Design an enzyme around this catalytic site. Sequence first.
Site, PDB file in Angstrom:
ATOM      1  N   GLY A 267       0.808  -1.218   0.000  1.00  0.00           N
ATOM      2  CA  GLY A 267       0.000   0.000   0.000  1.00  0.00           C
ATOM      3  C   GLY A 267       0.841   1.267   0.000  1.00  0.00           C
ATOM      4  O   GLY A 267       2.021   1.233  -0.389  1.00  0.00           O
TER       5      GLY A 267
ATOM      6  N   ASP B  43      -8.022   9.593  -4.160  1.00  0.00           N
ATOM      7  CA  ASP B  43      -7.391   8.410  -4.765  1.00  0.00           C
ATOM      8  C   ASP B  43      -8.431   7.325  -5.123  1.00  0.00           C
ATOM      9  O   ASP B  43      -8.265   6.150  -4.807  1.00  0.00           O
ATOM     10  CB  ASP B  43      -6.274   7.860  -3.856  1.00  0.00           C
ATOM     11  CG  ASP B  43      -5.222   6.984  -4.519  1.00  0.00           C
ATOM     12  OD1 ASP B  43      -5.169   6.959  -5.778  1.00  0.00           O
ATOM     13  OD2 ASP B  43      -4.438   6.340  -3.778  1.00  0.00           O
TER      14      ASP B  43
END
Lengths: 295, 283
Positions: free
Chosen positions: A23, A141
């Site tokens: 991530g 995002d």
Amino acid sequence: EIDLSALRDPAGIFELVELVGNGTGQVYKGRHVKTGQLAAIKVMDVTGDEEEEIKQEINMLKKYSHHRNIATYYGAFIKKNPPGMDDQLWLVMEFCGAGSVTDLIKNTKGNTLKEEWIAYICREILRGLSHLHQHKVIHRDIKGQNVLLTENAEVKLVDFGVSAQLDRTVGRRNTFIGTPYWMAPEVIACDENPTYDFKSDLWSLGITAIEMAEGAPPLCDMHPMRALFLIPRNPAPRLKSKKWSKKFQSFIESCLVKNHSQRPATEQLMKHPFIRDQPNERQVRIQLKDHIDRT
Amino acid sequence: DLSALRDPAGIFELVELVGNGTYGQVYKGRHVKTGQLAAIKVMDVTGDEEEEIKQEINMLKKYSHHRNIATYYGAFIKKNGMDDQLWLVMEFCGAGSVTDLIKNTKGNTLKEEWIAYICREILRGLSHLHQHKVIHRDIKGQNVLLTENAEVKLVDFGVSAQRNTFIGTPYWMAPEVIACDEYDFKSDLWSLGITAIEMAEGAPPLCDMHPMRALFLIPRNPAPRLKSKKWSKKFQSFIESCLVKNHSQRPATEQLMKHPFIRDQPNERQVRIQLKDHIDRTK
Ligand SMILES: Nc1ncc(Br)c2ccc(-c3ccnc(F)c3)nc12
Ligand SMILES: [Mg+2]
């Protein structure tokens, strides 16, 4: 605010099972010791550099992960390490078994989804974003990699690592952060001096609907830098196929309006017939669940 | 002494699998010679579960002789590459669980009369155990069974106590029993309120969310209530008394039994027949 030093060691509370991936830090398939119930655990190292970013993500997660279309925060922990290693903080959240929308597309013949599923998935994203926007929050995002599916094909939003907490409802921001191919023209404020808002997330939703429709976002073939250049200059993208509905072609048309002032708000986009006029939310979910399950 | 238990070979036999339990399976059993039906809980003998196996057979022998508790008939050990499996034989409750009855019911709701009847029997059964210094720790519709004659029986002593250990089923767990960061008989009374809501709404409160998000929410959120205004003021009051996040202020078993939803209840025979008729209609 939040105090990181106040967070306990995850010792016999939670444990890591297997590495799911990476991530903004790693992401683990983890489990609640006593109950055996699965969780996803975001293991990231404590640094004074990422400290400003770590603090915001935990803040966003605690405050808004309650909504059904947002992967829920279970808690944070800090594993304390010897003088050799860095202390690592764990963000415990709802485990979404089926993986990302991006993965589902990859593991699908044709790398396209049934329009019924795109309408279902898009709705859930819109419900999730409406929650955030009503709470003065820009995700920044939105992409198929950040739209997750549970074992029962329920849609959950993830990664608050680049999110924004606006003060006033008439408040704007101008940071320039996200994923090139999914960035809104206005969010490409790398050359101007002034401003964007919740609308930026709605562009990304249109790009992700195209991603679910075509397998990849528009301008996938170019370097992110070439895309950064082209997105403002080229006209708003559209579905290359004429086989998609007039409703879907309209939804993309409304989502992708280069001029954000003229781009519809979250509340009005939710009213759109592609989102609003939809069949048995339960039947599509089951149909999708059935598709998730194969080899 | 476990080694003193005989092999059930030729005494009892397993007929069909009813369901599953706490790391052990539950079958519909039959006494060979008599043809009489029993519940047989088949679980593997391990030195790890030995401390837990011993307690379950202990409570079973001591308190199952009550009318609201499915009665212990005996234990057996199949001597076996393979692990030795122990069988716990109890009274067979023909109609199945309260949870099943709800599942196999249009609307997944029960008539308030039945909820009052069922709840009272659970309270009678719990009053028995609490007076005998016993906490059930897993009170749920799946552990409240119905006989052929719609009589209410309690099951599964596998997580019971003679406290703070953190064991049970998330949805039904009491705020205090969520002692997962370093609780008494009252804990069972919360679970009863959750099960009354389960019988009323089809599922426990927070069912829509993962057991983990529920574990998180139960302490922080206010005590649940029935979402419908169509239920009685007595039922709405009963739930209000049952679900008090502060256990110190939550009423004891004896006082909860005094409550008008439980106490002011008519022909125990008429409701049991009405329920029996509903059980029989569904199958
Ligand atoms: N919660 C989940 N369950 C299952 C899987 Br697979 C996940 C993958 C990734 C993420 C995730 C969460 C937060 N920030 C990110 F950047 C990624 N969450 C998962
Ligand atoms: Mg008995």
